[PDB]
Symmetry: D2
Subunit: 138 residues, 4 copies
Amino acid sequence: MIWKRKITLEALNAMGEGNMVGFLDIRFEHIGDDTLEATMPVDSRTKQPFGLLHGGASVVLAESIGSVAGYLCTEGEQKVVGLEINANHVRSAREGRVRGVCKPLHLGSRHQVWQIEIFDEKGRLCCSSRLTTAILLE
Amino acid sequence: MIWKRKITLEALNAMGEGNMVGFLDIRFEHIGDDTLEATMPVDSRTKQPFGLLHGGASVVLAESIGSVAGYLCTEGEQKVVGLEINANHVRSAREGRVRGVCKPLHLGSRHQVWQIEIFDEKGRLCCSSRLTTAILLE
Amino acid sequence: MIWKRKITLEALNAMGEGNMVGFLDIRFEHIGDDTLEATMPVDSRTKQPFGLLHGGASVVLAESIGSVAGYLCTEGEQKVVGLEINANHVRSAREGRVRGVCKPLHLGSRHQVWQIEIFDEKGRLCCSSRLTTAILLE
Amino acid sequence: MIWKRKITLEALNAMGEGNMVGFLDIRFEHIGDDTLEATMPVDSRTKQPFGLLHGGASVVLAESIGSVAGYLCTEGEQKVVGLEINANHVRSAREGRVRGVCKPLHLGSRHQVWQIEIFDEKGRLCCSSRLTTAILLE
Protein backbone atom coordinates (compact mmCIF):
# COMPACT_ATOMS: atom_id res chain seq x y z
CA MET A 1 0.00 0.00 0.00
CA ILE A 2 1.03 3.60 -0.65
CA TRP A 3 -0.25 4.70 2.75
CA LYS A 4 2.17 5.83 5.45
CA ARG A 5 -0.31 6.78 8.18
CA LYS A 6 -2.44 4.09 9.78
CA ILE A 7 -5.81 5.81 10.18
CA THR A 8 -9.29 4.27 9.92
CA LEU A 9 -12.18 5.59 7.83
CA GLU A 10 -13.99 6.15 11.12
CA ALA A 11 -11.23 8.56 12.18
CA LEU A 12 -11.22 10.13 8.69
CA ASN A 13 -14.92 10.89 8.80
CA ALA A 14 -14.57 12.07 12.40
CA MET A 15 -12.01 14.66 11.29
CA GLY A 16 -14.49 16.21 8.86
CA GLU A 17 -17.08 17.03 11.52
CA GLY A 18 -17.09 20.74 12.28
CA ASN A 19 -15.78 21.69 8.84
CA MET A 20 -16.82 21.70 5.16
CA VAL A 21 -16.51 17.92 4.75
CA GLY A 22 -19.04 17.20 7.49
CA PHE A 23 -21.25 20.09 6.38
CA LEU A 24 -21.73 18.53 2.92
CA ASP A 25 -21.98 15.02 4.38
CA ILE A 26 -18.93 13.87 2.39
CA ARG A 27 -18.10 10.40 3.72
CA PHE A 28 -15.07 8.17 3.18
CA GLU A 29 -16.27 4.63 2.56
CA HIS A 30 -13.33 2.64 1.24
CA ILE A 31 -9.55 2.52 1.15
CA GLY A 32 -7.53 -0.01 -0.82
CA ASP A 33 -3.83 -0.60 -1.39
CA ASP A 34 -3.72 2.44 -3.68
CA THR A 35 -7.23 3.91 -3.78
CA LEU A 36 -9.52 6.03 -1.62
CA GLU A 37 -13.27 6.41 -2.11
CA ALA A 38 -15.77 8.83 -0.61
CA THR A 39 -19.41 9.63 -1.34
CA MET A 40 -21.37 12.86 -1.34
CA PRO A 41 -25.12 13.48 -1.49
CA VAL A 42 -26.81 15.51 -4.18
CA ASP A 43 -29.05 17.59 -1.92
CA SER A 44 -29.97 21.15 -0.91
CA ARG A 45 -26.43 21.90 0.26
CA THR A 46 -24.79 20.63 -2.93
CA LYS A 47 -27.38 21.51 -5.60
CA GLN A 48 -27.56 24.58 -7.85
CA PRO A 49 -30.80 26.62 -8.01
CA PHE A 50 -32.28 24.30 -10.63
CA GLY A 51 -31.84 20.99 -8.81
CA LEU A 52 -28.64 19.84 -10.50
CA LEU A 53 -25.50 18.94 -8.55
CA HIS A 54 -23.37 22.10 -8.26
CA GLY A 55 -20.15 21.62 -10.21
CA GLY A 56 -18.37 23.30 -7.33
CA ALA A 57 -19.55 20.52 -5.03
CA SER A 58 -17.91 17.92 -7.25
CA VAL A 59 -14.56 19.68 -7.00
CA VAL A 60 -14.88 19.92 -3.23
CA LEU A 61 -15.36 16.16 -3.11
CA ALA A 62 -12.44 15.65 -5.48
CA GLU A 63 -10.10 17.97 -3.62
CA SER A 64 -11.23 16.61 -0.26
CA ILE A 65 -10.42 13.04 -1.23
CA GLY A 66 -7.19 13.86 -3.04
CA SER A 67 -5.78 15.88 -0.16
CA VAL A 68 -6.54 13.34 2.58
CA ALA A 69 -5.11 10.55 0.41
CA GLY A 70 -1.97 12.61 -0.11
CA TYR A 71 -1.86 13.35 3.61
CA LEU A 72 -2.21 9.64 4.33
CA CYS A 73 0.91 9.24 2.17
CA THR A 74 3.04 11.50 4.39
CA GLU A 75 4.36 11.07 7.95
CA GLY A 76 4.09 12.81 11.32
CA GLU A 77 4.27 16.59 11.16
CA GLN A 78 4.30 16.51 7.37
CA LYS A 79 1.28 18.19 5.83
CA VAL A 80 -0.18 18.34 2.32
CA VAL A 81 -1.43 21.45 0.52
CA GLY A 82 -3.41 21.72 -2.71
CA LEU A 83 -1.36 23.65 -5.26
CA GLU A 84 -3.38 23.24 -8.43
CA ILE A 85 -6.64 21.52 -9.27
CA ASN A 86 -8.68 21.12 -12.45
CA ALA A 87 -11.77 19.16 -13.36
CA ASN A 88 -13.91 18.28 -16.35
CA HIS A 89 -17.67 18.31 -15.91
CA VAL A 90 -19.02 15.73 -18.32
CA ARG A 91 -22.26 14.57 -16.72
CA SER A 92 -24.90 16.18 -14.53
CA ALA A 93 -26.27 14.50 -11.39
CA ARG A 94 -29.67 15.12 -9.80
CA GLU A 95 -30.20 12.70 -6.91
CA GLY A 96 -28.85 10.10 -4.51
CA ARG A 97 -25.13 10.20 -3.76
CA VAL A 98 -22.16 10.53 -6.12
CA ARG A 99 -19.01 8.49 -5.60
CA GLY A 100 -15.46 9.73 -5.96
CA VAL A 101 -12.59 7.30 -6.50
CA CYS A 102 -9.06 8.67 -6.02
CA LYS A 103 -5.89 7.07 -7.41
CA PRO A 104 -2.24 8.26 -7.58
CA LEU A 105 -0.60 9.44 -10.82
CA HIS A 106 2.67 10.42 -9.14
CA LEU A 107 3.94 10.17 -5.58
CA GLY A 108 7.08 12.16 -4.82
CA SER A 109 9.05 13.42 -1.84
CA ARG A 110 7.75 16.96 -2.26
CA HIS A 111 4.79 16.65 -4.64
CA GLN A 112 1.95 14.34 -5.59
CA VAL A 113 -0.50 14.12 -8.45
CA TRP A 114 -3.90 12.56 -7.77
CA GLN A 115 -6.67 11.68 -10.22
CA ILE A 116 -10.24 11.66 -8.95
CA GLU A 117 -13.14 10.16 -10.91
CA ILE A 118 -16.63 10.85 -9.58
CA PHE A 119 -19.63 8.76 -10.66
CA ASP A 120 -23.39 9.03 -10.21
CA GLU A 121 -25.49 6.32 -8.53
CA LYS A 122 -25.81 4.49 -11.85
CA GLY A 123 -22.03 4.33 -12.29
CA ARG A 124 -21.73 7.00 -15.00
CA LEU A 125 -18.76 9.38 -15.03
CA CYS A 126 -19.91 12.85 -13.95
CA CYS A 127 -16.63 14.54 -13.12
CA SER A 128 -12.97 13.71 -13.70
CA SER A 129 -10.34 15.70 -11.84
CA ARG A 130 -6.63 16.01 -11.14
CA LEU A 131 -5.07 17.50 -8.00
CA THR A 132 -1.44 18.59 -7.58
CA THR A 133 -0.12 18.79 -4.04
CA ALA A 134 2.96 19.98 -2.20
CA ILE A 135 4.29 18.16 0.86
CA LEU A 136 5.41 20.60 3.55
CA LEU A 137 6.80 20.72 7.09
CA GLU A 138 5.97 23.86 9.08
CA MET B 1 -21.07 46.36 -21.23
CA ILE B 2 -20.81 42.62 -21.88
CA TRP B 3 -24.17 41.64 -20.35
CA LYS B 4 -27.04 40.45 -22.57
CA ARG B 5 -29.57 39.89 -19.75
CA LYS B 6 -30.76 42.31 -17.09
CA ILE B 7 -30.71 41.36 -13.43
CA THR B 8 -30.47 42.72 -9.89
CA LEU B 9 -28.04 41.65 -7.18
CA GLU B 10 -31.17 41.17 -5.10
CA ALA B 11 -32.56 38.69 -7.61
CA LEU B 12 -29.20 36.95 -7.91
CA ASN B 13 -28.84 36.47 -4.18
CA ALA B 14 -32.48 35.39 -3.88
CA MET B 15 -31.91 32.52 -6.34
CA GLY B 16 -29.32 30.89 -4.11
CA GLU B 17 -31.73 30.51 -1.19
CA GLY B 18 -32.44 26.86 -0.52
CA ASN B 19 -29.40 25.59 -2.42
CA MET B 20 -25.57 25.52 -2.25
CA VAL B 21 -24.77 29.22 -2.73
CA GLY B 22 -27.39 30.24 -0.17
CA PHE B 23 -26.24 27.81 2.52
CA LEU B 24 -22.63 29.00 2.14
CA ASP B 25 -23.84 32.60 2.39
CA ILE B 26 -22.12 33.49 -0.87
CA ARG B 27 -23.35 36.94 -1.86
CA PHE B 28 -23.13 38.88 -5.09
CA GLU B 29 -22.14 42.40 -4.12
CA HIS B 30 -21.14 44.12 -7.35
CA ILE B 31 -21.91 44.16 -11.05
CA GLY B 32 -19.77 46.33 -13.32
CA ASP B 33 -19.56 46.88 -17.07
CA ASP B 34 -17.62 43.63 -17.51
CA THR B 35 -16.98 42.40 -13.97
CA LEU B 36 -19.05 40.50 -11.38
CA GLU B 37 -18.09 40.09 -7.71
CA ALA B 38 -19.30 37.89 -4.86
CA THR B 39 -18.01 37.17 -1.35
CA MET B 40 -17.98 34.00 0.78
CA PRO B 41 -17.49 33.56 4.56
CA VAL B 42 -14.42 31.80 5.85
CA ASP B 43 -15.78 29.41 8.27
CA SER B 44 -16.87 25.96 9.52
CA ARG B 45 -18.90 25.64 6.32
CA THR B 46 -15.86 26.44 4.14
CA LYS B 47 -12.85 25.29 6.18
CA GLN B 48 -10.80 22.12 5.81
CA PRO B 49 -9.91 19.96 8.85
CA PHE B 50 -6.88 22.05 9.79
CA GLY B 51 -8.64 25.39 10.10
CA LEU B 52 -7.87 26.93 6.69
CA LEU B 53 -10.13 27.84 3.77
CA HIS B 54 -10.98 24.66 1.84
CA GLY B 55 -9.54 24.72 -1.68
CA GLY B 56 -12.85 23.34 -2.91
CA ALA B 57 -14.69 26.24 -1.29
CA SER B 58 -12.66 28.59 -3.48
CA VAL B 59 -13.63 26.65 -6.58
CA VAL B 60 -17.26 26.71 -5.51
CA LEU B 61 -17.13 30.50 -5.44
CA ALA B 62 -15.30 30.72 -8.77
CA GLU B 63 -17.72 28.41 -10.56
CA SER B 64 -20.70 30.24 -9.01
CA ILE B 65 -19.60 33.70 -10.17
CA GLY B 66 -18.24 32.46 -13.50
CA SER B 67 -21.36 30.47 -14.38
CA VAL B 68 -23.86 33.21 -13.57
CA ALA B 69 -21.69 35.74 -15.40
CA GLY B 70 -21.65 33.36 -18.35
CA TYR B 71 -25.43 33.11 -18.22
CA LEU B 72 -25.82 36.89 -18.19
CA CYS B 73 -23.86 36.98 -21.43
CA THR B 74 -26.38 34.76 -23.23
CA GLU B 75 -29.95 35.36 -24.44
CA GLY B 76 -33.41 33.85 -24.47
CA GLU B 77 -33.62 30.10 -23.94
CA GLN B 78 -29.85 29.81 -24.19
CA LYS B 79 -28.08 28.31 -21.18
CA VAL B 80 -24.52 27.90 -19.92
CA VAL B 81 -22.84 24.75 -18.59
CA GLY B 82 -19.40 24.52 -17.01
CA LEU B 83 -17.03 22.28 -19.01
CA GLU B 84 -13.63 22.76 -17.43
CA ILE B 85 -12.39 24.54 -14.36
CA ASN B 86 -8.81 24.93 -13.17
CA ALA B 87 -7.36 26.79 -10.22
CA ASN B 88 -4.09 27.67 -8.56
CA HIS B 89 -4.30 28.11 -4.79
CA VAL B 90 -1.67 30.75 -4.05
CA ARG B 91 -2.60 31.71 -0.50
CA SER B 92 -4.75 30.43 2.33
CA ALA B 93 -7.41 32.26 4.36
CA ARG B 94 -8.37 31.74 8.01
CA GLU B 95 -11.21 34.14 8.81
CA GLY B 96 -13.54 36.87 7.63
CA ARG B 97 -14.70 36.69 4.02
CA VAL B 98 -12.96 36.34 0.68
CA ARG B 99 -14.14 37.94 -2.53
CA GLY B 100 -14.12 36.72 -6.09
CA VAL B 101 -13.71 39.12 -9.00
CA CYS B 102 -14.83 37.68 -12.34
CA LYS B 103 -13.90 39.12 -15.74
CA PRO B 104 -14.11 37.61 -19.26
CA LEU B 105 -11.23 36.21 -21.30
CA HIS B 106 -13.40 35.02 -24.18
CA LEU B 107 -17.09 35.49 -24.96
CA GLY B 108 -17.80 33.42 -28.05
CA SER B 109 -21.00 32.20 -29.66
CA ARG B 110 -20.47 28.64 -28.45
CA HIS B 111 -17.87 29.00 -25.70
CA GLN B 112 -16.81 31.34 -22.91
CA VAL B 113 -13.71 31.42 -20.75
CA TRP B 114 -13.97 33.27 -17.45
CA GLN B 115 -11.22 34.37 -15.06
CA ILE B 116 -12.05 34.47 -11.35
CA GLU B 117 -9.55 35.84 -8.81
CA ILE B 118 -10.32 35.41 -5.12
CA PHE B 119 -8.83 37.70 -2.49
CA ASP B 120 -8.72 37.66 1.29
CA GLU B 121 -10.02 40.70 3.21
CA LYS B 122 -6.61 42.36 3.03
CA GLY B 123 -6.62 42.31 -0.76
CA ARG B 124 -4.16 39.44 -1.14
CA LEU B 125 -4.67 36.97 -4.00
CA CYS B 126 -5.68 33.57 -2.63
CA CYS B 127 -6.86 31.73 -5.73
CA SER B 128 -6.61 32.26 -9.48
CA SER B 129 -8.98 30.21 -11.59
CA ARG B 130 -10.49 29.86 -15.03
CA LEU B 131 -13.86 28.44 -15.98
CA THR B 132 -14.61 27.32 -19.52
CA THR B 133 -18.29 27.15 -20.44
CA ALA B 134 -20.40 25.96 -23.34
CA ILE B 135 -23.48 27.82 -24.57
CA LEU B 136 -26.30 25.41 -25.32
CA LEU B 137 -30.08 25.38 -25.92
CA GLU B 138 -32.98 23.03 -25.18
CA MET C 1 -12.50 0.93 -32.11
CA ILE C 2 -13.21 4.54 -31.12
CA TRP C 3 -12.02 6.08 -34.38
CA LYS C 4 -14.41 7.25 -37.10
CA ARG C 5 -11.70 7.92 -39.69
CA LYS C 6 -9.54 5.21 -41.23
CA ILE C 7 -6.07 6.71 -41.64
CA THR C 8 -2.75 4.87 -41.42
CA LEU C 9 0.30 5.87 -39.38
CA GLU C 10 2.09 6.63 -42.65
CA ALA C 11 -0.55 9.23 -43.57
CA LEU C 12 -0.63 10.73 -40.08
CA ASN C 13 3.11 11.32 -40.23
CA ALA C 14 2.78 12.63 -43.79
CA MET C 15 0.36 15.28 -42.53
CA GLY C 16 2.96 16.37 -40.00
CA GLU C 17 5.56 17.37 -42.58
CA GLY C 18 5.76 21.09 -43.24
CA ASN C 19 4.47 21.96 -39.78
CA MET C 20 5.55 21.80 -36.12
CA VAL C 21 5.03 18.05 -35.74
CA GLY C 22 7.51 17.36 -38.53
CA PHE C 23 9.91 20.06 -37.38
CA LEU C 24 10.32 18.34 -34.00
CA ASP C 25 10.34 14.86 -35.57
CA ILE C 26 7.23 13.81 -33.66
CA ARG C 27 6.36 10.40 -35.10
CA PHE C 28 3.17 8.42 -34.56
CA GLU C 29 4.10 4.79 -34.01
CA HIS C 30 0.89 3.10 -32.90
CA ILE C 31 -2.88 3.30 -33.26
CA GLY C 32 -4.77 0.93 -30.99
CA ASP C 33 -8.43 0.15 -30.42
CA ASP C 34 -8.68 3.16 -28.12
CA THR C 35 -5.11 4.50 -27.80
CA LEU C 36 -2.69 6.57 -29.85
CA GLU C 37 1.09 6.75 -29.41
CA ALA C 38 3.91 8.89 -30.80
CA THR C 39 7.56 9.42 -29.92
CA MET C 40 9.69 12.56 -29.96
CA PRO C 41 13.47 12.91 -29.78
CA VAL C 42 15.24 14.76 -27.00
CA ASP C 43 17.66 16.77 -29.15
CA SER C 44 18.66 20.30 -30.21
CA ARG C 45 15.14 21.28 -31.28
CA THR C 46 13.47 20.11 -28.05
CA LYS C 47 16.11 20.72 -25.36
CA GLN C 48 16.52 23.63 -22.95
CA PRO C 49 19.94 25.36 -22.79
CA PHE C 50 21.24 22.65 -20.46
CA GLY C 51 20.57 19.40 -22.29
CA LEU C 52 17.24 18.54 -20.66
CA LEU C 53 13.96 18.15 -22.55
CA HIS C 54 12.11 21.48 -22.67
CA GLY C 55 8.90 21.12 -20.66
CA GLY C 56 7.23 22.89 -23.56
CA ALA C 57 8.16 20.14 -26.01
CA SER C 58 6.47 17.52 -23.83
CA VAL C 59 3.32 19.62 -23.97
CA VAL C 60 3.63 20.00 -27.75
CA LEU C 61 3.85 16.22 -27.93
CA ALA C 62 0.83 15.76 -25.65
CA GLU C 63 -1.40 18.22 -27.46
CA SER C 64 -0.35 16.83 -30.86
CA ILE C 65 -1.27 13.24 -29.98
CA GLY C 66 -4.46 14.24 -28.19
CA SER C 67 -5.72 16.54 -30.94
CA VAL C 68 -5.07 14.02 -33.72
CA ALA C 69 -6.70 11.31 -31.60
CA GLY C 70 -9.69 13.58 -31.05
CA TYR C 71 -9.75 14.36 -34.75
CA LEU C 72 -9.72 10.62 -35.56
CA CYS C 73 -12.89 10.28 -33.49
CA THR C 74 -14.87 12.73 -35.61
CA GLU C 75 -15.78 12.54 -39.29
CA GLY C 76 -15.93 14.47 -42.55
CA GLU C 77 -16.02 18.26 -42.19
CA GLN C 78 -15.77 18.11 -38.40
CA LYS C 79 -12.56 19.30 -36.76
CA VAL C 80 -11.22 19.23 -33.21
CA VAL C 81 -9.82 22.24 -31.36
CA GLY C 82 -7.95 22.24 -28.06
CA LEU C 83 -9.74 24.31 -25.42
CA GLU C 84 -7.76 23.48 -22.28
CA ILE C 85 -4.50 21.69 -21.62
CA ASN C 86 -2.73 21.00 -18.34
CA ALA C 87 0.45 19.07 -17.71
CA ASN C 88 2.47 17.95 -14.69
CA HIS C 89 6.22 17.63 -15.17
CA VAL C 90 7.38 14.86 -12.88
CA ARG C 91 10.74 13.91 -14.41
CA SER C 92 12.92 15.54 -17.05
CA ALA C 93 14.51 13.59 -19.90
CA ARG C 94 18.06 13.96 -21.20
CA GLU C 95 18.37 11.75 -24.26
CA GLY C 96 17.03 9.26 -26.78
CA ARG C 97 13.32 9.55 -27.50
CA VAL C 98 10.29 9.91 -25.24
CA ARG C 99 6.96 8.24 -25.90
CA GLY C 100 3.50 9.72 -25.49
CA VAL C 101 0.57 7.40 -24.80
CA CYS C 102 -2.87 8.93 -25.31
CA LYS C 103 -6.13 7.42 -24.02
CA PRO C 104 -9.68 8.84 -23.89
CA LEU C 105 -11.33 9.82 -20.61
CA HIS C 106 -14.51 11.06 -22.30
CA LEU C 107 -15.71 11.14 -25.91
CA GLY C 108 -18.81 13.28 -26.46
CA SER C 109 -20.53 14.64 -29.58
CA ARG C 110 -19.29 18.17 -28.80
CA HIS C 111 -16.38 17.64 -26.42
CA GLN C 112 -13.66 15.14 -25.58
CA VAL C 113 -11.12 14.69 -22.80
CA TRP C 114 -7.82 12.91 -23.41
CA GLN C 115 -5.06 11.87 -21.03
CA ILE C 116 -1.53 11.72 -22.44
CA GLU C 117 1.35 10.05 -20.61
CA ILE C 118 4.95 10.66 -21.69
CA PHE C 119 7.74 8.29 -20.62
CA ASP C 120 11.51 8.22 -21.19
CA GLU C 121 13.29 5.42 -23.05
CA LYS C 122 13.42 3.64 -19.68
CA GLY C 123 9.64 3.72 -19.26
CA ARG C 124 9.74 6.21 -16.40
CA LEU C 125 6.91 8.77 -16.34
CA CYS C 126 8.19 12.20 -17.34
CA CYS C 127 5.03 14.16 -18.08
CA SER C 128 1.33 13.47 -17.50
CA SER C 129 -1.16 15.65 -19.34
CA ARG C 130 -4.88 16.19 -19.94
CA LEU C 131 -6.37 17.77 -23.07
CA THR C 132 -9.93 19.07 -23.37
CA THR C 133 -11.25 19.56 -26.91
CA ALA C 134 -14.30 20.88 -28.71
CA ILE C 135 -15.78 19.17 -31.76
CA LEU C 136 -16.61 21.78 -34.39
CA LEU C 137 -18.09 21.73 -37.88
CA GLU C 138 -17.30 25.18 -39.30
CA MET D 1 11.12 45.10 -8.80
CA ILE D 2 10.74 41.37 -8.21
CA TRP D 3 14.05 40.50 -9.89
CA LYS D 4 16.85 38.99 -7.78
CA ARG D 5 19.45 38.32 -10.51
CA LYS D 6 20.92 40.81 -12.94
CA ILE D 7 20.61 39.99 -16.64
CA THR D 8 20.32 41.60 -20.06
CA LEU D 9 18.04 40.81 -22.99
CA GLU D 10 21.11 40.22 -25.14
CA ALA D 11 22.27 37.48 -22.75
CA LEU D 12 18.80 35.96 -22.46
CA ASN D 13 18.42 35.60 -26.22
CA ALA D 14 21.98 34.26 -26.63
CA MET D 15 21.22 31.33 -24.31
CA GLY D 16 18.49 29.92 -26.54
CA GLU D 17 20.93 29.54 -29.44
CA GLY D 18 21.45 25.92 -30.38
CA ASN D 19 18.44 24.75 -28.35
CA MET D 20 14.63 24.81 -28.61
CA VAL D 21 13.93 28.51 -28.08
CA GLY D 22 16.72 29.46 -30.46
CA PHE D 23 15.35 27.28 -33.27
CA LEU D 24 11.82 28.64 -32.83
CA ASP D 25 13.08 32.25 -33.02
CA ILE D 26 11.52 33.08 -29.63
CA ARG D 27 12.89 36.46 -28.64
CA PHE D 28 12.87 38.19 -25.28
CA GLU D 29 12.17 41.86 -25.97
CA HIS D 30 11.10 43.52 -22.72
CA ILE D 31 11.84 43.27 -19.01
CA GLY D 32 9.58 45.36 -16.80
CA ASP D 33 9.23 46.02 -13.07
CA ASP D 34 7.56 42.63 -12.60
CA THR D 35 7.03 41.40 -16.15
CA LEU D 36 8.94 39.56 -18.87
CA GLU D 37 7.92 39.48 -22.53
CA ALA D 38 9.00 37.46 -25.56
CA THR D 39 7.68 37.01 -29.09
CA MET D 40 7.44 33.89 -31.26
CA PRO D 41 6.69 33.59 -34.99
CA VAL D 42 3.57 31.97 -36.37
CA ASP D 43 5.09 29.92 -39.18
CA SER D 44 5.95 26.42 -40.40
CA ARG D 45 7.82 25.69 -37.15
CA THR D 46 4.95 26.65 -34.86
CA LYS D 47 1.91 25.63 -36.92
CA GLN D 48 -0.25 22.52 -36.81
CA PRO D 49 -1.30 20.61 -40.00
CA PHE D 50 -4.26 22.88 -40.81
CA GLY D 51 -2.33 26.15 -40.91
CA LEU D 52 -3.06 27.60 -37.46
CA LEU D 53 -0.72 28.19 -34.51
CA HIS D 54 0.01 24.99 -32.60
CA GLY D 55 -1.49 25.19 -29.13
CA GLY D 56 1.60 23.36 -27.96
CA ALA D 57 3.65 26.21 -29.40
CA SER D 58 1.88 28.75 -27.21
CA VAL D 59 2.71 26.56 -24.21
CA VAL D 60 6.34 26.41 -25.25
CA LEU D 61 6.45 30.23 -25.25
CA ALA D 62 4.61 30.39 -21.92
CA GLU D 63 6.89 27.94 -20.13
CA SER D 64 10.02 29.55 -21.60
CA ILE D 65 9.28 33.01 -20.25
CA GLY D 66 7.78 31.71 -17.02
CA SER D 67 10.74 29.48 -16.20
CA VAL D 68 13.31 32.18 -16.89
CA ALA D 69 11.31 34.82 -15.04
CA GLY D 70 11.18 32.40 -12.11
CA TYR D 71 14.93 31.82 -12.27
CA LEU D 72 15.39 35.62 -12.26
CA CYS D 73 13.56 35.80 -8.94
CA THR D 74 15.93 33.37 -7.21
CA GLU D 75 19.51 33.76 -5.98
CA GLY D 76 22.84 31.97 -5.75
CA GLU D 77 22.83 28.34 -6.83
CA GLN D 78 19.05 28.12 -6.53
CA LYS D 79 17.27 26.91 -9.64
CA VAL D 80 13.71 26.64 -10.93
CA VAL D 81 11.86 23.62 -12.26
CA GLY D 82 8.41 23.69 -13.79
CA LEU D 83 5.83 21.70 -11.78
CA GLU D 84 2.45 22.18 -13.46
CA ILE D 85 1.33 24.08 -16.53
CA ASN D 86 -2.23 24.81 -17.63
CA ALA D 87 -3.53 26.91 -20.48
CA ASN D 88 -6.81 28.02 -22.03
CA HIS D 89 -6.64 28.45 -25.82
CA VAL D 90 -9.11 31.20 -26.71
CA ARG D 91 -8.05 32.37 -30.17
CA SER D 92 -6.05 30.86 -33.02
CA ALA D 93 -3.17 32.72 -34.73
CA ARG D 94 -2.43 32.42 -38.46
CA GLU D 95 0.51 34.75 -39.14
CA GLY D 96 2.98 37.36 -37.93
CA ARG D 97 4.19 36.89 -34.37
CA VAL D 98 2.50 36.35 -31.03
CA ARG D 99 3.88 37.80 -27.82
CA GLY D 100 3.68 36.45 -24.30
CA VAL D 101 3.50 38.66 -21.23
CA CYS D 102 4.64 36.96 -18.04
CA LYS D 103 3.67 38.33 -14.62
CA PRO D 104 3.78 36.77 -11.12
CA LEU D 105 0.80 35.55 -9.09
CA HIS D 106 2.94 34.19 -6.29
CA LEU D 107 6.65 34.49 -5.45
CA GLY D 108 7.32 32.22 -2.50
CA SER D 109 10.39 30.66 -0.89
CA ARG D 110 9.69 27.20 -2.28
CA HIS D 111 7.05 27.86 -4.93
CA GLN D 112 6.17 30.32 -7.67
CA VAL D 113 3.05 30.77 -9.79
CA TRP D 114 3.39 32.70 -13.03
CA GLN D 115 0.66 33.97 -15.35
CA ILE D 116 1.51 34.22 -19.05
CA GLU D 117 -0.89 35.78 -21.54
CA ILE D 118 -0.14 35.46 -25.27
CA PHE D 119 -1.53 37.99 -27.76
CA ASP D 120 -1.66 38.18 -31.55
CA GLU D 121 -0.32 41.14 -33.55
CA LYS D 122 -3.61 42.97 -33.06
CA GLY D 123 -3.46 42.77 -29.29
CA ARG D 124 -6.09 40.02 -29.02
CA LEU D 125 -5.72 37.35 -26.33
CA CYS D 126 -4.89 33.95 -27.85
CA CYS D 127 -3.79 31.93 -24.84
CA SER D 128 -3.87 32.35 -21.06
CA SER D 129 -1.72 30.06 -18.95
CA ARG D 130 -0.32 29.64 -15.46
CA LEU D 131 2.99 27.98 -14.69
CA THR D 132 3.65 26.66 -11.20
CA THR D 133 7.31 26.27 -10.29
CA ALA D 134 9.34 24.80 -7.46
CA ILE D 135 12.50 26.50 -6.22
CA LEU D 136 15.24 23.92 -5.70
CA LEU D 137 18.84 24.22 -4.56
CA GLU D 138 21.28 21.66 -6.00
